[PDB]
Design a protein around this motif. Structure first.
Motif, mmCIF file in Angstrom:
data_model
loop_
_atom_site.group_PDB
_atom_site.id
_atom_site.type_symbol
_atom_site.label_atom_id
_atom_site.label_comp_id
_atom_site.label_asym_id
_atom_site.label_seq_id
_atom_site.Cartn_x
_atom_site.Cartn_y
_atom_site.Cartn_z
ATOM 1 N N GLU A 5 9.503 1.787 -1.882
ATOM 2 C CA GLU A 5 9.999 2.656 -2.934
ATOM 3 C C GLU A 5 11.400 3.127 -2.597
ATOM 4 O O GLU A 5 12.375 2.645 -3.167
ATOM 5 C CB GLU A 5 9.087 3.870 -3.126
ATOM 6 C CG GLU A 5 7.748 3.548 -3.764
ATOM 7 C CD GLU A 5 6.919 4.787 -4.049
ATOM 8 O OE1 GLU A 5 6.603 5.530 -3.090
ATOM 9 O OE2 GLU A 5 6.584 5.012 -5.235
ATOM 10 N N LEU A 6 11.490 4.043 -1.641
ATOM 11 C CA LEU A 6 12.766 4.615 -1.242
ATOM 12 C C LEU A 6 13.297 4.229 0.139
ATOM 13 O O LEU A 6 13.825 5.078 0.852
ATOM 14 C CB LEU A 6 12.679 6.141 -1.349
ATOM 15 C CG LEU A 6 11.328 6.751 -0.949
ATOM 16 C CD1 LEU A 6 10.935 6.310 0.450
ATOM 17 C CD2 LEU A 6 11.409 8.258 -1.023
ATOM 18 N N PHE A 7 13.183 2.964 0.524
ATOM 19 C CA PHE A 7 13.693 2.573 1.831
ATOM 20 C C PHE A 7 14.163 1.138 2.004
ATOM 21 O O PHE A 7 13.653 0.208 1.383
ATOM 22 C CB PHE A 7 12.669 2.898 2.925
ATOM 23 C CG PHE A 7 12.843 4.262 3.528
ATOM 24 C CD1 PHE A 7 13.967 4.560 4.293
ATOM 25 C CD2 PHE A 7 11.904 5.263 3.306
ATOM 26 C CE1 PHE A 7 14.157 5.839 4.828
ATOM 27 C CE2 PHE A 7 12.082 6.546 3.834
ATOM 28 C CZ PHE A 7 13.212 6.834 4.597
ATOM 29 N N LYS A 42 5.891 -2.167 -7.462
ATOM 30 C CA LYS A 42 4.992 -1.365 -6.641
ATOM 31 C C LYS A 42 4.360 -2.273 -5.595
ATOM 32 O O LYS A 42 4.347 -1.963 -4.405
ATOM 33 C CB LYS A 42 3.888 -0.745 -7.497
ATOM 34 C CG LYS A 42 3.660 0.737 -7.236
ATOM 35 C CD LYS A 42 3.567 1.059 -5.751
ATOM 36 C CE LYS A 42 3.396 2.555 -5.527
ATOM 37 N NZ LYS A 42 3.474 2.946 -4.088
ATOM 38 N N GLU A 63 13.482 11.284 0.980
ATOM 39 C CA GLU A 63 13.774 10.250 1.966
ATOM 40 C C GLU A 63 14.157 10.776 3.342
ATOM 41 O O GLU A 63 14.735 10.048 4.149
ATOM 42 C CB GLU A 63 14.896 9.357 1.436
ATOM 43 C CG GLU A 63 14.673 8.893 0.003
ATOM 44 C CD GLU A 63 14.715 10.037 -1.009
ATOM 45 O OE1 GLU A 63 14.258 9.835 -2.156
ATOM 46 O OE2 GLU A 63 15.214 11.131 -0.662
ATOM 47 N N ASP A 100 2.074 6.926 0.191
ATOM 48 C CA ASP A 100 3.058 7.568 -0.671
ATOM 49 C C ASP A 100 3.007 9.100 -0.713
ATOM 50 O O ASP A 100 2.289 9.739 0.061
ATOM 51 C CB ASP A 100 2.931 6.997 -2.087
ATOM 52 C CG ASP A 100 2.866 5.475 -2.094
ATOM 53 O OD1 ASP A 100 3.759 4.830 -1.503
ATOM 54 O OD2 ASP A 100 1.922 4.920 -2.692
#
Lengths: 583, 583
Positions: free
Chosen positions: A63-65, A393, B4, B98
């Protein structure tokens, strides 16, 4: 440069030796807030003479990396380093401590990988990759021996089948329909518990040194193994090394001897009496089942018992490894000593453990070889079956964990999708062979080791522990051949190539709100590309490729797709189990 | 909520057992971008009956990070959990995967600490805390025995002293001026290498089973130990378990036998001949000193040798532990086996290793007890001596590492400030006894174990390996008593209380561009507060405190400071070695 996002920890997956000379370096940052990042390493002694920036490349993005590869072969089996973390023309290099602005003068404050010791090295049995599993519950699989018990005969249910009562599944049976699996096309087999227990699920171990009388004996097992090791198929046995069935002798002693019991510490005492009734198990048990006390894995004598036990079968049965019923609760120490042992008995021994959660802890080459890749499983099912997660996803879940583990272990992940502990893939979907097929595929399309829960190649609708463990269907009539064929094909297919085995793994489509997937894998001979369509129906795709190769031959139908424009057109019927290589 | 930034990894410092029932949970985030964060844990079985949010509290804050405490005692020695990560009225809880938006329904995807196994538990010899070290180089300390060598007599230098040649320091000497250290007020002593070597620094080990003839023998050592264990002082010996002096027998064999050598693998072969000249050491050596080949720590026989070796002395000399010359290069495995051994010989054995970098790897209760806390050192010196870092920076460096390690190990950190491997505190400053004193203090003011490089309590200006290891000054004349007194005071002081030993540790001043420091520590009896002034001169302070106590008695001068306003006024002469408690 979103500074508070980056991370790098020695060992685990963020720094490890792949072999005894080369090393990998991982680094994480925000999705796309990182132009580039070079690995600045070398020797901590003659620094100004051994430094070489290693262009870390993007290997995965959750997702965020953003995560980064980096292949390093320390000139002198040792490396001290930092990182570059670059963006635009903005540069800031990471040290053991802070984020410098000017190139680090002294290697002193730089990260360091002591020395490459070919011993500490993680070397999981590489024969797993080539190998393709197939799980089997001894209790209700096959019964080539009429002498078992008084209860229930073979299959009976359909939608609501298999109660927590009884059936006469034996080992001999396996020895029978063995040429059957041989037909199915298997490489290995995982056997659930099959040690003198007092229940259908043999997790109620009475003696870690004997095969339940109903099942058979060593020979039967051996005689079963021998034909396997003849049909080129490894074998795995369940290791109930955490809890022992109420039956188990040392326990009885404690029960029928209360305190004075000489085996007082063989487990875990909490209350003088061994009562429980409705209160609470006066002794540390599995979850909360008195008929399963937890073994004092730290206890000396207890160790040896299980130890010599583990090695025993390996030694005499010549099995191919141990699956650890539930390891995420047994002393990490015993786990240590365990390996060394199961290694001096059979190096190639496979130490698989049951860990449903992130287990980079046990995968340090210090305890396990692999685990139940439920995280993986938790993705596919969460995508193809429940279909609640989209494409990205999926790729995303195949990032937080794709990098989470080291290059090797990852490549040897026991990536299954169903078992006796959970429901069955089929029901997870619902007679939607199509939907299932696309999943089963990804399984035999990703890297690591895939596992086939017995009965499925034929088509079986299970449920939970009682359901899931539905009796086997030996009547040729009930035989979803188009499904079995699917398997065989998918199987041999997983064999027909190496890219799918352990090749690369890119992606050419995942765009957010989408359900069409496509990825790439390859070696220096054949380059294949797989595509799948989750759409409730048809859907055509468009995507670019490379030239080095020669063409695009439809695999299954051995048909042929053409590069055409600088992009290949690909049609999906509704659940496009369609995939192909490229001469 | 700067998503993050957060991080949480199982084990290391981000999840570990302090004891066999209670557990600590750490979590990091942006400096002040986190209103609060609760720990949501419990049992992975009866979830809806064992869940209790544990208010994680802020324990440390480096440059850009917030870390969180959390004391948990899993009802059933096992815990599955997540985190809350709260801000304003904005809530988002962290799972194994998550960041959920709604309270996690199934504990399945939550972090997990298998089971509290009192074995895997980290139990470093708690006697270190109470203890206060004092390092000593046998070569040039004391020579109570005229029989040593032909070279150089005692001290000679002043500013440019001590060459890499020779002197006759012996053990007997230590046996002599022992009552001297007794005067100094020590708790323990670390001895540099003192095993049959062929150089002033005994890191050129010829035999891991003998004391250099010049030094003495076992008895001398023992006779030396006995009075120590009589004066209530532990003892440490250097473990050159990585490289062996060119002399070392097995090596000779390989040299004077080339290939055919039976000890071919006892080390690391690279080139048939054992040549080097100007090219490169045909064998893996220390850095690049042929007279120091690296031992094949993985080799079986090699293991036992060093193994029985380590235990040997412990066994017969009855020493108090081993310092590991250089461990960040020796098989982590041997390190494992090592402990178990040095434990079955003397549980309370102290396994200290030389690791200048972040070593949470070895501090997993699986290998070491402690290390050379150079990171710590790298702070103080980088603050008081070089005075390039301010106050906050200091507190900051005491965060990236304060949390970096687990609660225990941290409390047992061999926090020194100088040694034979580096320069001396004094010169680091420059005759600025003042500046030094304030550092030496922090040392005996922080938690973990402090270490006094011999000669300093008296005042000695060293340099690097040749300088730093300057001969000892036994002429009462050269005796910075006001400095020795400083020490004694600081010493007994470190003893006089427990808060300084292992109490809390807050801060009431660090404001960026500043050089005045103040922190707090305390137990349930006495609460003390230390303050220091780096200013080139005087500087007065203002800061609040609590009421529970009774007053504020100036320690040293046994004078008395008053709370006065809701804030206490505190004056600093220029380098305020001033600190006090509070009745």
């Amino acid at each position: 440069m979103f500074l508070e996002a980056v991370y790098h920890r020695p060992r685990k997956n963020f720094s490890y030796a792949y072999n005894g000379t080369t090393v990998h370096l991982r680094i994480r940052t925000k999705k796309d807030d990182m132009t580039a990042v070079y690995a600045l390493a070398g020797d901590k002694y003659m620094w100004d003479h051994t430094m070489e920036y290693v262009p870390m490349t993007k290997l995965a993005t959750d997702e965020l990396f953003d995560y980064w590869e980096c292949e390093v072969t320390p000139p002198y089996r040792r490396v001290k380093y930092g990182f570059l973390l670059q963006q635009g023309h903005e540069k800031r290099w990471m040290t053991e401590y802070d984020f410098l602005t000017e190139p680090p003068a002294n290697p002193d404050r730089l990260f360091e990988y002591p020395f490459i010791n070919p011993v500490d090295v993680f070397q999981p049995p590489a024969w797993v990759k080539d190998a393709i599993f197939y799980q089997i519950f001894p209790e209700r699989f096959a019964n080539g021996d009429t002498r078992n018990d008084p209860e229930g005969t073979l299959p009976w249910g359909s939608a609501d089948p298999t109660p927590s009562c009884f059936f006469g599944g034996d080992l001999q049976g396996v020895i029978d329909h063995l040429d059957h699996l041989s037909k199915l096309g298997v490489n290995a087999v995982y056997f659930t518990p099959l040690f003198k227990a007092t229940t259908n699920h043999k997790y109620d171990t009475e003696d870690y040194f004997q095969i339940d009388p109903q099942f058979g004996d060593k020979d039967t097992l051996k005689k079963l193994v021998d034909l396997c090791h003849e049909r080129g198929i490894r074998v795995l046995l369940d290791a109930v090394f955490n809890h022992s069935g109420r039956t188990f002798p040392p326990f009885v002693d404690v029960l029928k001897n209360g305190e004075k019991s000489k085996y007082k510490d063989w487990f875990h005492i909490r209350s003088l009496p061994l009562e429980v009734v409705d209160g609470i198990p006066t002794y540390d048990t599995f979850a909360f089942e008195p008929l399963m006390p937890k073994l004092n894995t730290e206890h000396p004598d207890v160790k040896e018992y299980l130890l010599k036990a583990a090695e025993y079968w390996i030694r005499e049965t010549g099995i191919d490894g141990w699956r650890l019923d539930v390891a995420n609760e047994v002393s990490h120490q015993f786990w240590r000593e365990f390996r060394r042992v199961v290694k001096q008995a059979n190096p190639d021994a496979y130490i698989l453990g049951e860990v449903w959660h992130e287990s980079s802890i046990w995968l340090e080459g210090d305890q396990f070889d692999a685990v139940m890749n439920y995280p993986f499983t938790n993705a596919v099912l969460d995508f193809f079956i429940h279909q609640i997660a989209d494409a990205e996803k999926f790729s995303f879940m195949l990032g937080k964990q794709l990098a989470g583990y080291p290059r090797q272990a990852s490549e040897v992940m026991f990536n299954l999708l169903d078992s006796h502990d959970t429901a069955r893939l089929l029901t997870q979907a619902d007679g939607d062979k199509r939907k299932m097929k696309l999943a089963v595929l990804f399984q035999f399309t990703y890297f690591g080791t895939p596992c086939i829960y017995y009965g499925d190649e034929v088509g079986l609708d299970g449920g939970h522990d009682p359901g899931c463990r539905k009796c086997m269907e030996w009547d040729e009539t009930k035989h979803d051949k188009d499904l079995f064929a699917f398997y065989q094909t998918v199987i041999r297919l997983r064999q027909a190539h190496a890219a799918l085995r352990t090749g690369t793994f890119k992606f050419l489509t995942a765009e957010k709100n989408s359900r069409q997937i496509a990825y790439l894998r390859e070696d220096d001979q054949d380059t294949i590309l797989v595509v799948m369509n989750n759409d409730k129906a048809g859907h055509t795709l468009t995507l670019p490729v490379r030239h080095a190769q020669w063409t695009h031959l439809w695999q299954d139908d051995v048909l042929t797709a053409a590069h055409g424009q600088l992009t290949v057109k690909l049609p999906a019927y509704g659940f496009a189990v369609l995939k192909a290589s490229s001469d």
